């Protein structure tokens, strides 16, 4: 009858192409559900699936004139929407999906059932997600240095591990984490390690969403933070000075609900999924316009204490009261972070921490017995 | 005469395509009227209706270059506009239409008569719209926990009843409902339950209104995070876009007098650690242990059809003769 | 079986075309990776590679109707992304790549391995990169006039050399360098020499990035400093006047991060790589909103002392305390800089300085004692 | 092998089409490098060069469909970018290039070497560029009435000559000139004479470039003054009033740098070559925010003294100290300026002045002693 | 020659498509001059006029690729613009034009002559514009209740009648009218009755009634301003533009009485006293 239509029928039989409720056409090639709303990746798939059809159905796909007709057919046989990103406890890599509860790796058809559109962005090398390795040893030493495992720093350490490991599951976190710490303490190093670990599922935005009207006009910062598991926020200046705007109370509640509102540029989708762990890398005590019970149950704070300095300024940091330990700075560490030498080691550590506090359920608990004004509000 | 034109005339004979006064062409496929003013959904229909024309008129529709000629023809015959969404006592699902006065579910050609261009977005599973089911029991318990049926809170429960059941009719209401209450009282829980129930007929906007292009033919609009009297009057009018939705405001403090209704939340949910800190507070009348796993089984839509049946029974209790909302000064 | 497809397969074999994570299709023509998001530069490569295939596959390549079919076929085979600009110690010219650790010049296939998308913009002439030449002698005299090799000007000269030579490596710099100095001193001369030396890998922006929230709406100034290796910021108004806004302290923290957030116009990429050395051509001592140890470890200051003047006002400059030496102005010097007379000589000087302080590892230290308020804050 | 490709190769052999670093395909037709970055002017070339190819390659180019194939090919052989507007002592007319150092006119191939993208906009009539003509006599009378050749008005006349003549050279001038003078004195007359003389290479902007932040958002006033050789700025209001903001000094400092920073509408290029002589048609004494040494060496001023008035108000002008000689208003003069009666006469006068002060090296010197506050800052 | 050219010539012969000075291509289908410079409606007319041409010229209009050719020919054949809404005393209904000088109703080609772009929004039922109707009795009673016909309220009711009748003709009014009155009096009811009466042409270009230096910027021919401006509230150059009526205490019938009121004081000319 029509060969260019039977080809589309066969391609639709394998369920490689799907249409989501957002209007996009997610496509499954190279063991990853991919989407991009300026280029029809479907015409890629037609070529990639070419070596799966009968011989006479494959020699006709080597022509862009006959590979946009089949795309036109396929685009008119996708009438029903399919919901995506349902399973929260999955980590999607550019070549499969890893199950967190048991630490096994899926590939091919086994990874297709869990429709995870957003991926980490890098392949999952099997012979690096190991327990014993020199990189793992030095990473563990570095993490011990950043957060010492002492008795009075045990609750803080466990909260640090909980917050870091929470940036792996796609559930809607109900709390925001503050990263208060003084100069040269380890906040940015932890951020870079996390970014090299989880990859594409990690975005850092500005402080506009923290304190501004996140409703007027286009705001791509909210638009990019859709299905992103980890969100970081720098730009936390002191609010004790004149002219500095306080952190808006309603923004915290707006960022903690399971479907945030925000329109990108040249579009009208104002619904964005909220899988993000929102971490606010600050340097001073933050303040809010008003304090109420609607905020003391949404703030979690972890304190970084150990400091890294050169020997010249070593003696100037020993007497500081906000400082609990002065370690030696490593000038070459930041070089071997962007080189991704501690990528899979940190991934293994994060998975081990995840299957230690979030196995039954996931929930981040607030802890306001760490903010002075919140302490005043708590009698 | 002309095959590609007889095909278009036959497709227009079935009345599967109609032109709305808003300038958008509505499409009838999979037992639901859909529209999208950014794509020629019409070219979808011309393929689906392929199994309704004779064999010689069907093999010619497997060709995208020949499925835009007939689409152009169809677009050039739709001159007379036809009104849409005129029945207010109907609820459209992705696979049919449910009547509210009777509770009977219409599907197929019977669903085509009511031109409902909007829909909830999910298929109406038949063996879930039942009265007795464990999910219904636990949902009913949750609703009682949020709003107990005490002698003092009977009028408040009745007003909450009317307001929630009002999120089913396609007419224009004339009153704005507030959700004043303290923290951990169930406002967001009620919003999420209603999202699981009614689905797509649901939008939440910012505080600027107190965006507008999205509140067209929707049946429920909300605005949370409340930290203009003329806007209340501008919203309760039947042309803002058809204002067929009810407006609910999720606030925490105390925020024309004949257009505002307020329903209060008294129950407080807390962990055992902070239980004692809420017993002595006057803002709550009862404190119950917080359910950590309840939020998880909402996005799963475990209590979707249970709340839908509750809403239908709830509607056929106050709005059967007419629909109207009375302000509480 | 298909000539238009075999041509694309052969082109893909040579790895002349690659796809970057930024959605860009970089192209290898004339010993340089070129890219233009507004022009399918691929069709240039598709033509220029025409003298590499068999004769039957070459005469078919002289047709624009069959040269967009090959680019259509190629655009559906680039499914994976390739990371670009990873090697930090390389300098890309429009006809090759120069290795900094040895001074060797690489071209052809040896230049293809280091994927350096951004290049200087000019060819590398071999018979100019020499130590003995009149241009080199007069440039050395010029530089010794700008920064004399005295004993009190020894540390400043070394810091000046380090800062100037750092604008060759693609690493990230965590230190901002100011160019404080009085009028007619030679800041703009150094800027122009640097621009003539490195070419495209050099931009100058406004002072908004220093004192403004670079998040609100589009900000092309942040958007253009992507993979640039040197960024100058002139227009430093005196902040002692009323209504002048002080330098935003957190912008300094942002500019030293490995990746910055800023959106361009008519696009939606908020991730900009930061290879830039930020130099602030100022005329007065800068002030900030707040001073903290998180700022004093990011700032280094060089001093320009020698003054250039006409003989009419020479006596009025001898008694000034802001100049340690008065030299005779050269009217024609500003002419033979835009003529690129001192281009390869300054490039040789920069390379010679680079293989003197940045060979083991690159790092720019701060000099907090050179600022009055900073000097107050240590004690 | 392919006629449509050999035609493009032959066209590229004559170097009639070039690719600029700004992304524009400059075209060489009618002895003028023309470009327009909204319509591909190349096609005009493809037709105009039609009478230079063999006959078999000529009658074919009469079809618009063919000329899109040749243009599509030519767009694909231009990889090497070219620099433009390098020679400063050349004046480009719509039909050639005039050499300023000899007063000799070039047209044709010898005019192609100096790649000058911007032209005056009118043909150069050879039989008007003469010493003796009635128009020359009346223009000389007009100019001697505007600036009399007295002994006390000799330096001012020379500075007026130098400032006017500097609007012919393509180098970057480093000084700002004012046209201070009272009412009905001859400032707009000089502006209109200059506009009729140099034509396109002359723009007039507002005071935004002088007293405003030319960095926030789009600002076309800085995008039009790219490669323009003269920029007039009238409407300098009295700053003695309330709310009137002073002239920004850093604006002056940026207006005299080789490339100025400013973005246009619907584009992203920020750098524009500053070949402009900046003249401010002021009416009152200007004041700035802060006064320093960096502002002394960028400010020059000429004073207009002769007053033109009707005989009715002639008596009221004799006793005024702001005027040194009262002439009679010529009502018909303004009419015979927009008719370009004194176009080539003033062009010859400007060239004669150019070969009197700018032959060895072109430089604009300041006059800081002609302003009261500046004189106060002077010692 | 060309069939596709003679078709365009015939279509322009009937004067169905016209070009306006605003850059629009008004088109004539369903007995209404409907225009929209966002949707090229012209193609529809090429099909609509399809059953008016010879069959040889009509059987080639069943092709979209040969109906953008006729549209192209027509589009570059309309060189001279036309002006619209030149007859103030007309009322455009979706099925014709109602003359206001006498009250006769027109439809079709004779309705095509009046180039009115903005219609009332509803069709004109022929067997409702009658004097005797129970709904007309009810509306008359409602009007009497709102504005009693007393002697002390005769000037007030006369000015009320004139102000209401002004919102029927398309000329340029030059007097603002006030509705100063207390709550629960019937001003909003009057507005609703007026909106049901005249429909689309009551809401600000080509509109005939508006509800609410400005008093001068709202009383000049071009802002075109065809609307009587009335504000629903609770220098010598200013007194000559303000008229006040005080409030103290059924669509086609309302149109009928409006027409009768109009043909009582504005038959020679229209002008509203302050
Ligand atoms: N375990 C470690 N051992 C040695 N050096 C370390 C270790 N962890 C981090 N460092 C180094 O110590 C320095 C700490 O800088 P870091 O970016 O963590 O500070 P910060 O808290 O972000 O500072 P700022 O307040 O200025 O933002 C870096 O150079 C980092 O590479
Ligand atoms: N019937 C119930 N029984 C037990 N727990 C419940 C019940 N209803 C709700 N909860 C729990 O109580 C929690 C309180 O959150 P809730 O949705 O009431 O917040 P909210 O009113 O929006 O808060 P805020 O005022 O701080 O913005 C819910 O998240 C849910 O887990
Ligand atoms: N070594 C040198 N020998 C002679 N002349 C020099 C030398 N170095 C610079 N000059 C000249 O001295 C002047 C220095 O001014 P320059 O243009 O470099 O700006 P600057 O000193 O930063 O000015 P300002 O601070 O006032 O903006 C220029 O005219 C330059 O040509
Ligand atoms: N040499 C001359 N002889 C006679 N009349 C002249 C001569 N030069 C100029 N004029 C005339 O004198 C008048 C002066 O007008 P002009 O444009 O010079 O004023 P202006 O300085 O721009 O004005 P203002 O400062 O009042 O705004 C004009 O009518 C001009 O034509
Ligand atoms: N004369 C009347 N006839 C019928 N209904 C009336 C009359 N006067 C007032 N009403 C009723 O009063 C209600 C409110 O009147 P309203 O329009 O608010 O008065 P006002 O114009 O002073 O605001 C209306 O719904 C209307 O039905
Ligand atoms: Mg940091
Ligand atoms: Mg809430
Ligand atoms: Mg300078
Ligand atoms: Mg003037």
C-beta of residue D263 within 8 angstroms of C-beta of residue C220: yes
Q: What is the CA radius of gyration of chain C?
A: 24
Place of tokens 């800023």: C262
DSSP per-residue codes, C260-313: E----TT-----EE--PEEEE--SS---BS---HHHHTSEEE--B-EEEE-GGG
CB-based contact, C24 to chain D, within 8 Å: no
Phi, psi of C166 (to 5 degrees): -65, -15
Evaluate the CA torsion angle C332, C334, C340, C345 in order and state its sign.
positive
Q: Residue A298's CB: how many other CB atoms inside 10 A?
A: 19
Please, which residues have CB within 8 angstroms of residue D235's CB and are 6 or more apart in sequence? D206, D207, D281
Evaluate the CA torsion angle D353, D356, D357, D362 in order and state its sign.
positive
Label the pairing between strands B203-204 and B220-226: parallel
Give the ligand with the smallest distance to the CA of C333: 3
Q: Residue B26's CB: how many other CB atoms inside 10 A?
A: 21
Residues in chain D: 379
Q: Mutation test of ligand 4: which of D281, D308, D339 has the most ligand atoms closer than 8 Å to its C-beta?
A: D308
Q: Mutation test of ligand 3: which of C330, C331, C342 has the most ligand atoms closer than 8 Å to its C-beta?
A: C330
For ligand 6, a single-atom ion, the residues with CB < 5 A are A 188
Q: Mutation test of ligand 2: which of A256, A294, A297 has the most ligand atoms closer than 8 Å to its C-beta?
A: A294
Evaluate: CB of B184 within 6 angstroms of ligand 2.
Answer: yes
Query: Chain A residue with minimal CA distance to B207?
Result: A215
CA distances from A264 to A220, B259, C237 (A): 5, 35, 36
Label the pairing between strands C259-260 and C272-273: antiparallel
CB-based contact, B320 to chain A, within 8 Å: no
C-beta of residue C369 within 8 angstroms of C-beta of residue C375: yes
Distance, CA of C212 to CA of C246 (rounded, Å): 9
Answer whether B296 sits within 8 Å of A361, measured CB to CB.
yes
Q: How far is A366 from chain C (nearest CA, A)?
A: 28
CB-based contact, E108 to chain B, within 8 Å: no
Phi, psi of B299 (to 5 degrees): -65, -25
Answer whether A234 sits within 8 Å of C253, measured CB to CB.
yes
Q: How far is C136 from chain A (nearest CA, A)?
A: 35
Neighbours of chain D (3+ CB pairs under 8 A): C
DSSP per-residue codes, A145-160: HHS---STTHHHHHHH
Distance, CA of D257 to CA of D274 (rounded, Å): 7
Place of tokens 């078919």: C60
CB-based contact, A235 to chain C, within 8 Å: yes
Among C256, C249, C24, smallest CA distance to A192 is for C256
Answer whether B30 sits within 8 Å of A80, measured CB to CB.
yes
CB half-sphere exposure, B302, CA atoms < 13 A: 14
Whole-number Å distance, alpha carbon E189 to ligand 5 midpoint, is: 6
DSSP per-residue codes, C179-247: --B-SSSSHHHHHHHHHHHHTTS-EEE-TTTTSS-TTSS--HHHHH-SS-SEEEE-----TTSTTPPPB
Distance, CA of E101 to CA of E266 (rounded, Å): 9
Distance, CA of D131 to CA of B150 (rounded, Å): 109
Q: How far is CA A209 from the centre of its chain?
A: 17
DSSP single-letter state for residue E81: -
C-beta of residue A77 within 8 angstroms of C-beta of residue B66: no
Backbone dihedral region of D270: left (phi > 0), alpha (psi from -120 to 50 degrees) or beta?
Answer: alpha
Evaluate the CA torsion angle A167, A170, A171, A175 in order and state its sign.
positive
Evaluate: CB of E145 within 6 angstroms of ligand 5.
Answer: yes
Name the 3-class secondary structure at C333.
coil
List Cβ<8 Å contacts ≥24 apart for E1-4: E3/E56, E3/E57, E3/E60, E4/E60, E4/E66, E4/E69, E4/E70, E4/E73
Distance, CA of D51 to CA of D40 (rounded, Å): 20
And the tokens for B43?
Answer: 């070219």
Evaluate: CB of A142 within 6 angstroms of ligand 1.
Answer: yes
Please, which residues have CB within 8 angstroms of residue A210's CB and are 6 or more apart in sequence? A233, A247, A248, A251, A280
C-beta of residue C51 within 8 angstroms of C-beta of residue C148: no
Q: Which helix (H) or strand (E) holds A359?
A: none
Neighbour-count burial of D122, counting CB atoms closer than 10 A to its CB (0-12 exposed, 13-18 middle, 19+ buried): middle
Answer whether A44 sits within 8 Å of C363, measured CB to CB.
no
Place of tokens 């007194």: E239
And the tokens for A102?
Answer: 């048991």
Strands (E), chain A: 17-19, 25-28, 33-34, 90-93, 96-99, 104-106, 176-178, 203-205, 230-233, 259-261, 271-273, 277-280, 299-301, 307-309, 326-328
Evaluate the CA torsion angle A248, A250, A253, A257 in order and state its sign.
negative
Distance, CA of B265 to CA of B187 (rounded, Å): 8
Evaluate: CB of A155 within 6 angstroms of ligand 2.
Answer: no
Distance, CA of B250 to CA of A201 (rounded, Å): 31
Backbone dihedral region of B43: left (phi > 0), alpha (psi from -120 to 50 degrees) or beta?
Answer: alpha
Query: Chain B residue with minimal CA distance to A289?
Result: B227
Distance, CA of B30 to CA of A77 (rounded, Å): 12
Distance, CA of B42 to CA of B35 (rounded, Å): 9
Distance, CA of C108 to CA of A302 (rounded, Å): 52
Please, which residues have CB within 8 angstroms of residue A11's CB and are 6 or more apart in sequence? A17, A45, A46, A49, A70, A74
DSSP single-letter state for residue A246: P
Among A161, A249, A251, A272, smallest CA distance to A206 is for A251
Evaluate: CB of C287 within 6 angstroms of ligand 3.
Answer: no
Among A265, D261, A263, smallest CA distance to C218 is for A265
DSSP per-residue codes, B34-53: E--TTS-THHHHHHHGGGGS
C-beta of residue E28 within 8 angstroms of C-beta of residue E11: no
Among E21, E208, E222, E32, smallest CA distance to E116 is for E32
Query: Chain C residue with minimal CA distance to A309?
Result: C297
Distance, CA of C169 to CA of D67 (rounded, Å): 46
C contacts of A122 (beta carbons < 8 Å): none
Label the pairing between strands A230-233 and A203-205: parallel
Neighbours of chain C (3+ CB pairs under 8 A): A, D
CA distances from D129 to B269, D30, D103, D141 (A): 95, 21, 10, 18
Among D126, D134, D121, smallest CA distance to D342 is for D134
And the tokens for A275?
Answer: 């899988």
**In chain C, positions 279-308, which contact chain A (CB-CB < 8 Å)?**
289-290, 292-294, 297
And the tokens for E165?
Answer: 């009748």
Q: How far is C259 from chain A (nearest CA, A)?
A: 10
CA distances from A21 to A17, A25, A80, A221, C117 (A): 14, 9, 9, 21, 37
Per residue, the 3-state secondary structure of B259-321, as one string, reads CEEECCECCEEECHHHCHHHHCCCCCCCEEECCCCCCHHHHCCCCHHHHHHHHHHHHCCCCCC
C-beta of residue E231 within 8 angstroms of C-beta of residue E134: no
Q: Which helix (H) or strand (E) holds D78?
A: none
**In chain B, positions 43-72, which contact chain A (CB-CB < 8 Å)?**
43-44, 47-48, 59, 62-65, 67
Among E120, E88, E124, E122, smallest CA distance to E106 is for E124
C-beta of residue B169 within 8 angstroms of C-beta of residue B100: yes
Distance, CA of E151 to CA of E155 (rounded, Å): 8
Kindly give the residue spans of alpha helices, DSSP state H, lying in B166-279: 187-198, 229-235, 276-279
- DSSP-assigned beta bridge partners for residue B17: B27
Among A64, A90, A62, A74, smallest CA distance to A25 is for A74
Please, which residues have CB within 8 angstroms of residue A12's CB and are 6 or more apart in sequence? A74, A77, A78
Answer whether B1 sits within 8 Å of E62, measured CB to CB.
yes
Label the pairing between strands E96-99 and E90-93: antiparallel
Label the pairing between strands A230-233 and A326-328: unpaired
Distance, CA of C194 to CA of C346 (rounded, Å): 8
Name the 3-class secondary structure at A58.
coil
CB-based contact, A1 to chain B, within 8 Å: yes
Q: Which helix (H) or strand (E) holds E220?
A: none
DSSP single-letter state for residue A247: B
And the tokens for A308?
Answer: 């890294």
Kindly give the residue spans of alpha helices, DSSP state H, lying in C115-175: 134-146, 154-165
Evaluate the CA torsion angle A10, A14, A16, A21 in order and state its sign.
positive
And the tokens for C348?
Answer: 């040789």
CA distances from B277 to A364, A375, B117, D241 (A): 21, 15, 50, 64
Answer whether D171 sits within 8 Å of C59, measured CB to CB.
no
Distance, CA of D289 to CA of D246 (rounded, Å): 6
Rounded to 10 degrees, the C-alpha dihedral E112/E116/E119/E123 comes to: -20
Residue of C59, C208, C283 with shortest CB distance to D215: C208
- DSSP-assigned beta bridge partners for residue D277: D230
And the tokens for D98?
Answer: 């005039």
Place of tokens 């006009």: A217
CB half-sphere exposure, D339, CA atoms < 13 A: 7
Q: Could you identify the atom of ligand 1 that is nearest to the CA of residue A304? A: 21
The shares of helix, strand and coil residues in chain D, as percent rounded to the nearest 5, are 35, 15, 50
- DSSP-assigned beta bridge partners for residue E97: E92, E106
Among A179, A256, A170, smallest CA distance to A214 is for A256
And the tokens for B176?
Answer: 């704005």
Please, which residues have CB within 8 angstroms of residue B38's CB and are 6 or more apart in sequence? none
Q: Which of D216, D268, D378 to mutate to test the interface with C (most CBs of C within 10 A)?
A: D268
- Does an interface of 3+ CB pairs under 8 Å exist between B and D? no
CA distances from D151 to D155, D318, D353 (A): 9, 21, 19
The shares of helix, strand and coil residues in chain E, as percent rounded to the nearest 5, are 40, 15, 45
Q: Which helix (H) or strand (E) holds D98?
A: strand D96-99
- DSSP-assigned beta bridge partners for residue E41: none
Q: Mutation test of ligand 3: which of C237, C303, C308 has the most ligand atoms closer than 8 Å to its C-beta?
A: C308
And the tokens for B165?
Answer: 């059941």
- Strands across the sheet with D33-34, in order? D17-19, D25-28, D33-34
C contacts of A335 (beta carbons < 8 Å): 171, 361
Evaluate: CB of E162 within 6 angstroms of ligand 5.
Answer: no
CB half-sphere exposure, D190, CA atoms < 13 A: 30
CA distances from B221 to B136, B191, C78, C265, D167 (A): 25, 10, 45, 33, 65
């Amino acid at each position: 009858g029509n060969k260019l239509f039977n080809i589309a029928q066969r391609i639709l039989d394998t369920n490689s192409v799907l249409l989501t409720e957002r209007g996009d056409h997610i496509v499954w090639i190279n063991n990853s559900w991919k989407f991009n709303s300026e280029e029809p990746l479907i015409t890629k798939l037609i070529l990639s699936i070419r070596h799966q059809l009968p011989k006479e159905y494959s020699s006709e796909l080597l022509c862009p004139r006959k590979r946009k007709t089949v795309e036109a057919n396929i685009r008119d046989m996708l009438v029903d929407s399919v919901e995506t990103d349902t399973y929260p406890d999955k980590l999607p890599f550019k070549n499969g999906v890893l199950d967190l509860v048991d630490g096994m790796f899926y590939s091919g058809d086994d990874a297709k059932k869990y429709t995870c559109t957003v991926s980490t962005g890098f392949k999952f090398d099997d012979t690096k997600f190991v327990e014993d390795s020199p990189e793992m040893e030095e990473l563990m030493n570095i993490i011990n240095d950043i957060q010492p495992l002492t008795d009075e720093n045990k609750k803080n350490r466990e909260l640090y591990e909980k917050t870091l490991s929470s940036c792996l599951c796609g559930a809607t976190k109900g709390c925001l984490t503050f990263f208060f710490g003084e100069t040269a303490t380890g906040k940015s190093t932890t951020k870079r390690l996390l970014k090299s670990a989880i990859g594409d599922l990690f975005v850092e935005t500005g402080q506009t969403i923290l304190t501004d009207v996140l409703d007027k006009g286009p705001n791509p910062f909210i638009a990019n933070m859709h299905l992103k598991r980890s969100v970081f926020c720098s730009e936390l200046p002191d609010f004790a000075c004149s002219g500095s705007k306080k952190i808006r109370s309603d923004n915290i509640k707006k960022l903690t609900e399971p479907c945030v509102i925000g329109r990108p540029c040249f579009s009208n989708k104002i619904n964005n999924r909220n899988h993000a762990t929102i971490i606010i890398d600050t340097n001073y005590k933050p303040v809010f316009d008003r304090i109420d019970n609607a905020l003391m149950r949404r703030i979690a704070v972890v304190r970084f204490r150990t400091h890294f300095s050169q020997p010249s300024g070593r003696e100037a940091a020993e007497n500081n009261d906000a400082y609990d330990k002065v370690k030696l700075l490593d000038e070459g560490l930041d070089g071997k972070i962007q080189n991704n030498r501690y990528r899979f080691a940190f991934l293994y550590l994060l998975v081990k921490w995840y299957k230690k506090y979030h196995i039954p359920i996931m929930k981040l608990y607030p802890t306001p017995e760490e903010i002075p004004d919140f302490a005043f509000y708590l009698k």
